[PDB]
Design a protein around this ligand. Structure first.
Ligand SMILES: Cc1ncc(COP(=O)(O)O)c(C=O)c1O
Ligand SMILES: Cc1ncc(COP(=O)(O)O)c(C=O)c1O
Ligand SMILES: Cc1ncc(COP(=O)(O)O)c(C=O)c1O
Ligand SMILES: Cc1ncc(COP(=O)(O)O)c(C=O)c1O
Ligand SMILES: [Cl-]
Ligand SMILES: [Cl-]
Ligand SMILES: [Mg+2]
Ligand SMILES: [Mg+2]
Ligand SMILES: [Mg+2]
Ligand SMILES: [Mg+2]
Ligand SMILES: [Mg+2]
Ligand SMILES: [Mg+2]
Lengths: 391, 391, 391, 391
């Protein structure tokens, strides 16, 4: 079962040396006892033999093994944060003249990497609506190399029909590299590589760390794409420190029991918001009526705790402050995936500015919630007090 | 004095909160108390206000302040390792169609970044001999954007005439971006920005960490180049974890005493090797007669502990094993800059293969030594026993 | 609610400085800006002003505040492990000529502290059956200074009738110091200081850390006993490092969701064992019929995951190996409270040796289980295969 | 040589697993693969086999091995701080009816442990002047069990004549346990166990950590005393966390270079103070004419950087603030042994209160300096500016 796998993934004696968790091996230099040992380590420097800290130590190898098991991959590359994983995973597969197709709901830094870094290197990015499904085939060009998915989408939470997208891509361009930012599912609520996606990228910063106190990115690739990902990310010097790798492995051990609580509480909040007179729309993948909810129910094994809703009006600046400055339990901060509940607001034009070649279909202020581990009735009371401040 | 500055750099109450060292603030999310505080943080997100962990926490800000003071820069960008600092600093300043001019003695991963990553992104790379001095003017092309120095050079230790190179570049291409990998000097034995170099890059993994147990890159830029470095590195998701930042700041505090011992011991070893009947050549910047020694004496305030020498013969494979497998104090490992002494060997053709457009001028086996903090007479005895195994 | 309190306890801006979690302030030396500041710190050196690392840094103060809130105490002393907390908390309240009255089910190291350390310092120790209730009055001597409870008991899991014990102690010896080892409840499933117990001691090593990778003891005292505990423990140099304090605070944030899973899974396992033909007895506080279950039901707000059962025979060493060496999911290790399930065996004569002045009422091998976060059906299948190896 | 030993002590493959430094193995639970392995671990639970985190992990074993090598001991017990090491090492060897004879220059918390904890447990304490030498024999009682040395003394820096003290103790009470707080020498500038002392105690917090950011105590015993120290300290739950153990091992690797700088700089400052018109007395073991200097010269292999001096007046409150509040390089803080220079003031009556059965022989304000790694001419200028503020 998944909970059993999460408890045990990566925890073998060669890494733990007798403790429950892997040892933390901090190193740049790794010592070779003989020339023959150095030769063996060199041949196997990307295959789990100690060679140099930039390739990893036992602590990294343990996390990589866990991530490959849990996401069903051939290899797991590590990065200093999620944004580095996105940027370097895309970069690993493109060259001057290539085209990238990206969902218009991609995380904003991912879009900005494409428009501000890739563009000046001669790589063009085109965009698609997250519900395009099989019609994505019409957007694939002879030079399309990468198709970049993010399901649910950032902020607005739309869920792709991954089977339809993948089948369409494979009909026209079977060698294309299909990638997904699978952070919301923590890589485990949506088994991306089983759907024919080539690489599943996560900001392990979110639910894998689970406590808002480490940053790390991961990218798990299938056998076809692993060597290129591994070696090109390594040429960019991408790695994570051993201690953060240890904390990510450690986060896996409570991920199941945390996600179940985030799911239960966030769906309860979403159902309540959906009945609320001051709410126009709720964007939660698990809530009926949300964009792509059908595909969430069919293709995912659960939900996490991040979602958004649209208020019945556009808050003025004074109302925004009255609303946001006076919560007792929800905090304003970027990121998500921890034990604390968070809140942020965006006006519709702010979202339109990060929906390339598209418009938004709402006019109220959008509120993004991360539902943490607090008692849900306490969180509901905090939201109700917020509504009373703007009614 | 430098020792006083090393002890005190970056250690102000806003970061230390009453301890001697900065606090370790581990964070992705950073909490805004009000909308107005969030707006202030956003405006100052690259100016030392807490905004998001990818930009940094107090711990990173303290290290950045220290590095800017010590290297005389306007800002310091942080990276997961030295190789990431090199790759991402170069990438931050190029676009397709540009040309990079790099010393042929650059660290091999730096060269491989150019030939295997930059080339396919439309950026070409040419090469120069490290002693080219003023004649580098003749290699500057209409599209040359970056000139990349490394002094002393990797492995073979040639010291550039930086004043001559910089003046020649500035004559032809006043606005070119001149960068140096200043790891051997730990950024402090050679004050690169004072020579008109724009960006000083280090593998802080080496002497700044000082103990072979953390990896981190830094790049300190002048005011002209800082914004582009900062923002382009950020778009690639480049950062370091808070704990490694803390350990780098901590390493600064003993860097002076350590470097003085590495200098004293390595020069004594180099002087002894230069007299030895089994040694053809010694490549140590501080040793009279070594390539660019004149420029080391004029432009540096000291030496570190890394150097190389050439044996009086080409060792066979059996002799290589007899030599390297049987040291008692020197260990075989990559990297350097720690408290432990290290040894590695290369045959001439191995070096030729990483000297683009050039040949090597020696035929014996080259031995690279890192001289650590052990008693120097014990290290000399270990080297003497090695010579007896191959005589 | 408890979940909201656990998420938020100890997190105030003075400690977090903008992050979700408290900063990690590592220090011996704490720097006074002026003589005036040093005088204020000295006066308040046990009252939350920074004075010296042995008293604590911001990180410790944050944890102490959280523990005092959650357990309803006046102060929380910190120790290097649970055993240090037990030994030093008892030591803090005794002098030569005193008597300690301790439950015969106390953790063996607690008993050994009493019989091997206290005895030679002129402090005697007597014993009581954990179900003695109101009859403890007859065991209280004129020199009885400390009454030491542990509910549930170690290994055999008997639950005290705390109201009856406390009322009897206060009738006969109102000034006595009543202490409890409250580790099984994690200090939160049994609110000891609301029952008139003076000091609640925990091995935070167990459920508070929650991941088997830190060691730390805590003792939360009421107002009457705090000053003596604090100052006498400080005279023994008792403290914990800042990083383990941080990790204990961090563990609080998932404690609720973890404990609910440990309760659900362990009670299901206990119910299955209680109908199993190879099981003579099940010792689980939450299982109807277990010793002191009625007091658990009345006085606790939930259960954790540690319990035991007695087999239908005393296993030989060959049978123990066949049983224990071949589990797939349960591991053999000491301690408990983590995400992993653990198994250990005790022969009845081993238990008798640590039940002073009492006898054991079973003859089969006792198996102690820690039920972790794995899927319960997987754990049940592992236990079933174990039974088949010994049937 | 000592530098080579310090670099290499404790660093064997079974602890480093290929890195330069020991792995960091964080654990309470240590997992036994079989019943056979559990039995072997139990038999060897105090002899370097993994058994339970309270006994230690690989990281602790590596530190213990290093400390035993460097101090020439049979075993090394670890503690949460130096004060815990002192208190628990004394406690490990006493029982009701015993007497402790302690130098009246002992660190004040050591004295207070004896007078506030031991006294109420039936253990008495008497005192001796640090220069008593052979005349200590007259103070030894039939029940004297422990003789406790500290050389140099706390604050006032008097060096004992250890050969004369030890010979006198052995002539009258050969079975006594002779202990020393050897923190000032970092355990390596005075090889206590070679002088017939039984146990060498250190606050590893000071020079071994070396950076003012960890707390840890050590006690290295000879073969006669090791088992009692080890087992009685374990019964009090004394241990240190794995990460601080790692950082102590790491501190050893620069201890030699650091101590040489602290010696050179502090002696220069002491010589300057000794000719200064505002200075009445200088207490520095390495300065000719200081109390016990002849014993330091004979018995020590170097000096550290902590010493004191007496001003030519007793500063008023206004003068104390003018002097201490306005230093640019010296910080006011407790503890010492780091890279930062520190300053503290004590009035004569403060010292008199912690010199039991002795009298102070100065009337000016006493200033204790820790001389760090800053440039010594900068430190001298800071002291000179201080003198100008109180002239
Ligand atoms: C979907 C998604 N991908 C990537 C990231 C970036 O991760 P990091 O902040 O670790 O760089 C985030 C940030 O919030 C995210 O939400
Ligand atoms: C000169 C130089 N630059 C960069 C590096 C790369 O540093 P890192 O190993 O931290 O990526 C090294 C590696 O040995 C180096 O010697
Ligand atoms: C009930 C109880 N108290 C105290 C302890 C001791 O805690 P530590 O191992 O952290 O010293 C334990 C050990 O398993 C325990 O179970
Ligand atoms: C000589 C001496 N021993 C012991 C200690 C106590 O060490 P710790 O602060 O680690 O408890 C100190 C404190 O300054 C000390 O100077
Ligand atoms: Cl194709
Ligand atoms: Cl130009
Ligand atoms: Mg190896
Ligand atoms: Mg909150
Ligand atoms: Mg060595
Ligand atoms: Mg398991
Ligand atoms: Mg006054
Ligand atoms: Mg200072």
């Amino acid at each position: 079962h998944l909970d059993t796998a999460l408890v045990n993934a990566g925890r073998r004696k060669k890494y733990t040396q007798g403790s429950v968790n892997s040892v933390i091996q901090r190193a740049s230099s790794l010592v070779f006892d003989t020339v023959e040992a150095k030769k063996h380590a060199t041949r196997n420097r990307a295959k789990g033999e100690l060679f140099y800290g930039r390739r990893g130590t036992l602590t990294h190898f343990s996390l990589q093994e866990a991530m490959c098991e849990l996401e069903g991959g051939a290899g797991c590359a590590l990065f200093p944060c999620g944004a580095a994983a996105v940027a370097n995973t895309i970069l690993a597969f493109v060259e001057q003249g290539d085209h990238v197709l990206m969902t218009n709901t991609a995380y904003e830094p991912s879009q900005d990497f494409c428009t501000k870094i890739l563009a000046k290197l001669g790589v063009t990015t085109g965009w698609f609506d997250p519900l395009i499904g099989a019609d994505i085939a019409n957007l694939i060009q002879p030079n399309t190399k990468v198709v970049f998915l993010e399901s649910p989408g950032s902020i607005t939470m739309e869920v792709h029909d991954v089977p339809a997208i993948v089948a369409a891509v494979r009909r026209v361009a079977p060698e294309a590299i299909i990638m997904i930012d699978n952070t919301w599912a923590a890589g485990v609520l949506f088994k991306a590589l089983d759907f024919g996606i080539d690489i599943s990228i996560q900001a392990a910063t979110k639910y894998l760390i689970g406590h808002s106190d480490g940053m790390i990115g991961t990218a798990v690739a299938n056998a076809r794409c692993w060597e290129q990902l591994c070696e090109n990310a390594y040429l960019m010097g991408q790695m994570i420190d051993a201690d953060t790798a240890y904390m990510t492995s450690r986060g896996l051990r409570t991920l199941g029991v945390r996600l179940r609580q985030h799911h239960e509480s966030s769906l309860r909040v979403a159902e309540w918001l959906a009945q609320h007179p001051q709410v126009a729309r709720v964007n939660h993948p698990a809530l009926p009526g949300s964009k792509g909810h059908e595909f969430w129910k069919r293709d995912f094994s659960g939900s996490s705790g991040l979602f958004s809703f649209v208020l019945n009006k556009r808050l003025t600046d004074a109302e925004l402050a009255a609303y946001l400055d006076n919560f007792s339990l929800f905090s304003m901060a970027y990121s998500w995936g921890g034990f604390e509940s968070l809140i942020l607001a965006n006006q519709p034009e702010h979202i339109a500015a990060i929906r390339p070649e598209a418009e938004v279909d709402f006019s109220g202020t959008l509120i993004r919630l991360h539902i943490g581990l607090e008692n849900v009735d306490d969180l509901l009371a905090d939201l109700a007090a917020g509504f009373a401040r703007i009614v």
